[PDB]
Ligand binder design. Structure first.
Ligand SMILES: *[C@@H]1O[C@H](CO)[C@@H](O[C@@H]2O[C@H](CO)[C@@H](O[C@@H]3O[C@H](CO[C@H]4O[C@H](CO[C@H]5O[C@H](CO)[C@@H](O)[C@H](O)[C@@H]5O[C@H]5O[C@H](CO)[C@@H](O)[C@H](O)[C@@H]5O)[C@@H](O)[C@H](O[C@H]5O[C@H](CO)[C@@H](O)[C@H](O)[C@@H]5O)[C@@H]4O)[C@@H](O)[C@H](O[C@H]4O[C@H](CO)[C@@H](O)[C@H](O)[C@@H]4O[C@H]4O[C@H](CO)[C@@H](O)[C@H](O)[C@@H]4O[C@H]4O[C@H](CO)[C@@H](O)[C@H](O)[C@@H]4O)[C@@H]3O)[C@H](O)[C@H]2NC(C)=O)[C@H](O)[C@H]1NC(C)=O
Ligand SMILES: *[C@@H]1O[C@H](CO)[C@@H](O[C@@H]2O[C@H](CO)[C@@H](O)[C@H](O)[C@H]2NC(C)=O)[C@H](O)[C@H]1NC(C)=O
Ligand SMILES: *[C@@H]1O[C@H](CO)[C@@H](O)[C@H](O)[C@H]1NC(C)=O
Ligand SMILES: *[C@@H]1O[C@H](CO)[C@@H](O)[C@H](O)[C@H]1NC(C)=O
Ligand SMILES: *[C@@H]1O[C@H](CO)[C@@H](O)[C@H](O)[C@H]1NC(C)=O
Ligand SMILES: *[C@@H]1O[C@H](CO)[C@@H](O)[C@H](O)[C@H]1NC(C)=O
Ligand SMILES: *[C@@H]1O[C@H](CO)[C@@H](O)[C@H](O)[C@H]1NC(C)=O
Lengths: 38, 48, 242, 213, 97, 123, 123
């Protein structure tokens, strides 16, 4: 197998620094049961 | 929030064992280059 | 909500060591403890110890305080909630009374007072501790017999005679013929050799429409035997149907 | 063992039955929790009860637990035929380990009888070239699990080479065993026939092969 | 008692994957670099000297670098950083002689 | 033990509930490109008043924890008290109850709307 | 009978008060021309925190319904209980009390400011 250099698309250059990051949204409202009542 | 995977061997895809959370990523200098990656983060242990 | 599997049944001479494994899949390996429990025929069921993969902490029983070491590999993730792992135990200085079955058990909870309670269980690696050597089986095809003349049924099988040590797993047609099979427990002869029998119930009409092959797998001797049970019987009560 | 259960206990179908589990105070039961396991011999157990009175995940609501300061109990209401096995208890806490018990073999009464299905095999032709001979007497589908196997050489009792295995429980809620006779290639061609008796509740059953035929 | 009732919990560790508008941060000596706004940093927010980092033990989350939107928001941001820096600059229309 | 923001994401729901005030303290936090942050710090507070308005129209108002008179249905993954609060995480839980979250949200705001009108009678 | 948003606008004030939670659920709801919506979804939440701040500085805080220790003056259209809650609509009502709304709004926030200082004494 042979390998040759490439590029062109500039979206690759950023990935080499953003491989270890990702984005999430915090959903603080979770329901769950327990033996309480008002 | 933004999650930072903190293990030494990760091909960027799949589950990460040591996940940590951060507010702002590390300094990422926007180096517009081709073929040769320049002034980027160094990998850990074995080359990736 | 997962599955636990253990290494093959091995034979060890007394005074030597043995390392039995237990690999896991279908949950998070680091969230539950791994107990180890053994059951011999002269001492009943007996807990040994547990170990926590995330923390490495161990608790051992005073009887096994001084001759068992427990070791846990690291966690290999598979999904966001499930993983894959491994658990070993190593018992030194074996004795005759150590002959029995050994189990590994996933914990019950993560927090509370019943955290380490053995909930999910494995399959068991029977440990035989004897000075004798390993013997390979002698598989003899059982001639078919008459079970019902008016019902058109019968029963053939294979005779696994003289082997050591336990166990012996008998299959049929590479796991194809699984219904009607009855495998009987072995007998301990005055020479110390086990010998079980296997027999499957099949109708009399099945002759040149299906091939009967019994597979006796005896992993300690590294020998597999495949016999062709002849569908031509000798019972005089079944010859009326052919 | 230091933790003692009831040696045995009986019960009829559709009813209830209780098992005891007690011992000294070093193991039970003040400041000690209790568990319960359904353990069939040869197979792997199933957690029924933990923390004294709480069922395990998926466990049917037909089990229930009750602990005192000196003993703990387990009531299996609505008895099933697949319950006739052995049950063990354990005395644990959050810190220490399990101290198991002696075991309670529960016999479920009020069941239907089962007549044994016996099949005797003659020694194969490959064994007559070795040369040896082994009579294989297999007993199947009998309840309860307690049969006696006596061998006879031409209508005369045999006391040599007799061996019969323990009555073992099957997956269809019946019992099974096996008996073997070790004979020489000469007693095989000298006697007229060999038999295998299986006495069961007074009713003896017997199968006979013929080397002469 | 034995019958269970729902309860609300506000502020739980619960997150799902999503995309939102991301912004910038760039120290304070970088703002002293000045030189008539070099590259991007102008009214951008300065980085506080607190770099907070929290290791989420026991957690395992599946990443994916080849489907990451911080790329598409970084590429297209650098794309528009270019043009905003050339709009009020000298245009060479009469230089095609 | 202040583990930090989302510090108890793998901790059990019982274990995580001690951190409820650590995840909600950092939930609000206090020319172009300068609008990247404006249209995003606006989306940061509508996310807040959307959650707080649910907390308001339920029997909660006051924050962090709060009960309701809605009986929990068994078909919403029938676990036990010791199977949820001692052997599950909030991420793992909202995965089983992601189907029923919208069903449940209605009862809280309606069971509360019955309580207030009955409150005006008894005054 | 979930009539919907403003579903009870012609229903009597007594009849409409069962819908109070249906009008307030949809009160907050979660390059140019793209700013048409920004300057308008900003005006959508200042309208909210203007109303909620009145609900806060009164004896209400918690939502939907809430009493006050202000005696109702007879000169604010002297109807009866069965003439208001069984024979009038909220639109028709706020037409007679549009003159006095500003007068009344003061007493609620002042009668409440007397109650809290007295509350600090008795603690
Ligand atoms: C990420 O994921 C991880 C996994 O998913 C997760 O880890 C899990 O965390 C949970 C907690 O959230 C854990 O659950 C708890 O575990 C506690 C730890 O257990 C203790 O016991 C061991 C063993 O002790 C024996 O062995 C050693 C030898 O190694 C001896 O030194 C001991 O003396 C003892 O041996 C005796 O007995 C033997 C006979 O069997 C003899 O042979 C021997 O000679 C002795 O006689 C200890 O080694 C442990 O030490 C470790 O922990 C400390 C930190 O505390 C470390 O410094 C140390 O290095 C070790 O790592 C450990 O101490 C359980 O105790 C705990 O049960 C209690 O808590 C629950 C609630 O949490 C209660 O409901 C319950 O009632 C228990 O309460 C008691 O304990 C608390 C805590 O101290 C007390 O406050 C309380 O009052 C009570 O104590 C009193 O009451 C008792 C009443 O009976 C009485 O008996 C006591 O004596 C006392 O009076 C609970 O089960 C879980 O195990 C983890 N691991 C898993 C799930 O795998 C991790 O947290 C996650 N992280 C995040 C961020 O999410
Ligand atoms: C080029 O690579 C060298 C590696 O030798 C970088 O120098 C290291 O920088 C890191 C932090 O940036 C320090 O922790 C190391 O101590 C430095 N190495 C030595 C030998 O001092 C250098 O910063 C890189 N230059 C870039 C990326 O522009
Ligand atoms: C649930 O836990 C309670 C604890 O009191 C126990 O009594 C009950 O049997 C448990 N139910 C099941 C189905 O395990
Ligand atoms: C509980 O859920 C079932 C669906 O599994 C539904 O049919 C039932 O009506 C629900 N209970 C109530 C009180 O609505
Ligand atoms: C939620 O519903 C989907 C279909 O709408 C189903 O595939 C999935 O199994 C459900 N989740 C759980 C946890 O039951
Ligand atoms: C009620 O309204 C009248 C005006 O019609 C006013 O004179 C009077 O002072 C008001 N009552 C009080 C208590 O202020
Ligand atoms: C409100 O006041 C105006 C004058 O300010 C008056 O014309 C009108 O009649 C009043 N409304 C009512 C309902 O009395």
């Amino acid at each position: 197998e042979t390998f040759r250099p490439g590029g062109g698309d500039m979206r690759d250059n950023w990935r080499s620094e953003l491989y270890k990051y990702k984005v999430v949204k915090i959903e603080p409202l979770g329901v769950a049961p327990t033996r309480c009542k008002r | 929030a933004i999650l930072k995977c903190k293990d030494k061997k990760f091909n960027g895809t799949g589950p990460c064992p040591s996940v940590s959370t951060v507010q702002c990523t590390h300094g990422i200098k926007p180096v517009v280059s081709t073929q040769l990656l320049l002034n980027g983060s160094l990998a850990e242990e074995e080359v990736m | 909500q997962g599955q636990l599997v253990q290494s093959g049944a091995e034979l060890k001479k007394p005074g030597a060591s043995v390392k039995i494994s237990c690999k896991t899949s279908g949950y998070r390996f680091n969230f539950y403890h791994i107990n180890w429990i053994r059951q011999t025929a002269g001492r009943g069921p007996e807990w040994m110890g547990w170990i926590s993969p995330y923390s490495g902490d161990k608790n051992l029983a005073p009887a096994f305080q001084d001759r068992v070491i427990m070791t846990t590999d690291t966690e290999v993730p598979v999904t966001s909630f499930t993983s894959t792992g491994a658990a070993y135990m190593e018992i030194r200085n074996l004795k005759f009374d150590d002959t029995g079955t050994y189990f590994c058990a996933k914990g019950l909870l993560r927090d509370g007072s019943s955290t380490w309670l053995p909930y999910l269980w494995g399959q068991g690696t029977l440990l035989t501790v004897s000075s004798a050597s390993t013997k390979g089986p002698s598989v003899f095809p059982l001639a078919p017999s008459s079970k019902s003349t008016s019902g058109g049924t019968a029963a053939l099988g294979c005779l696994v005679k003289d082997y050591f040590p336990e166990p012996v797993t008998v299959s049929w047609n590479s796991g194809a013929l699984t219904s009607g099979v009855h495998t009987f427990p072995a007998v301990l002869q005055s020479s110390g050799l086990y010998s079980l029998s296997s027999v499957v119930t099949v109708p009399s009409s099945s002759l040149g429409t299906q091939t009967y092959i019994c597979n006796v797998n005896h992993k300690p001797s590294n020998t597999k035997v495949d016999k062709r049970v002849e569908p031509k019987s000798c019972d005089k009560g079944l010859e009326v149907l052919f | 063992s230091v933790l003692t259960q009831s040696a045995s206990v009986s019960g009829s179908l559709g009813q209830s039955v209780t098992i005891s589990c007690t011992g000294p105070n070093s193991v039970c039961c003040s400041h000690k929790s209790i568990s319960w396991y359904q353990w069939p011999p040869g197979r792997a157990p199933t957690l029924i009860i933990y923390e004294d009175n709480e069922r395990a995940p998926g466990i049917s609501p037909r089990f229930s637990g009750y602990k005192s300061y000196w003993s703990a109990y387990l009531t299996i209401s609505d008895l099933r035929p697949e319950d006739e096995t052995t049950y063990y208890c354990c005395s644990y806490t959050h810190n220490s380990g399990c101290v198991f018990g002696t075991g309670t073999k529960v016999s479920v009464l009020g069941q239907s009888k089962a007549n044994p299905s016996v099949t005797l095999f003659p020694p194969s032709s490959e064994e007559l070239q070795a040369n040896k001979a082994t009579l294989v007497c297999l007993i199947s589908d009998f309840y309860p699990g307690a049969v006696t196997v006596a061998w006879k050489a031409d209508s005369s009792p045999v006391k040599a080479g007799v061996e019969t295995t323990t009555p073992s429980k099957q997956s269809n809620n019946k019992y099974a065993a096996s008996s073997y006779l070790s004979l020489t290639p000469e007693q095989w061609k000298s006697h007229r026939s060999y038999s295998c008796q299986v006495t069961h509740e007074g009713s003896t059953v017997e199968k006979t092969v013929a080397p002469t035929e | 008692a034995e019958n269970l009732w729902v309860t609300v919990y506000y502020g739980v560790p619960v997150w799902k994957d999503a995309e939102t508008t991301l912004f910038c941060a760039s120290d304070a000596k970088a703002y002293e670099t000045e030189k008539h706004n070099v590259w991007a940093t102008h009214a951008c927010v300065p980085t506080d000297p607190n770099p907070q980092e929290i290791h989420l033990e026991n957690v395992t989350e599946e990443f994916n670098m080849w489907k990451n939107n911080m790329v598409e928001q970084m590429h297209t941001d650098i794309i528009s950083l270019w043009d905003q820096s050339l709009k009020p600059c000298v245009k060479l229309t009469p230089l095609c002689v | 033990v202040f583990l930090g923001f989302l510090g108890a994401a793998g901790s059990t729901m019982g274990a995580a509930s001690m951190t409820l005030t650590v995840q909600a303290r950092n939930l609000l936090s206090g020319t172009v490109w300068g609008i990247k942050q404006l249209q995003a710090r606006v989306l940061a507070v509508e996310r807040y008043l959307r959650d707080q308005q649910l907390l308001g129209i339920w029997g909660c108002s006051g924050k962090l924890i709060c009960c309701t008179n809605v009986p929990w249905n068994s078909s919403w993954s029938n676990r036990n008290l010791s199977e949820i609060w001692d052997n599950m995480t909030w991420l793992q839980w909202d995965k089983e109850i992601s189907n029923y979250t919208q069903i449940i949200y209605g009862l809280l705001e309606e069971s509360q709307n019955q309580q207030e009108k009955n409150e005006q009678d008894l005054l």
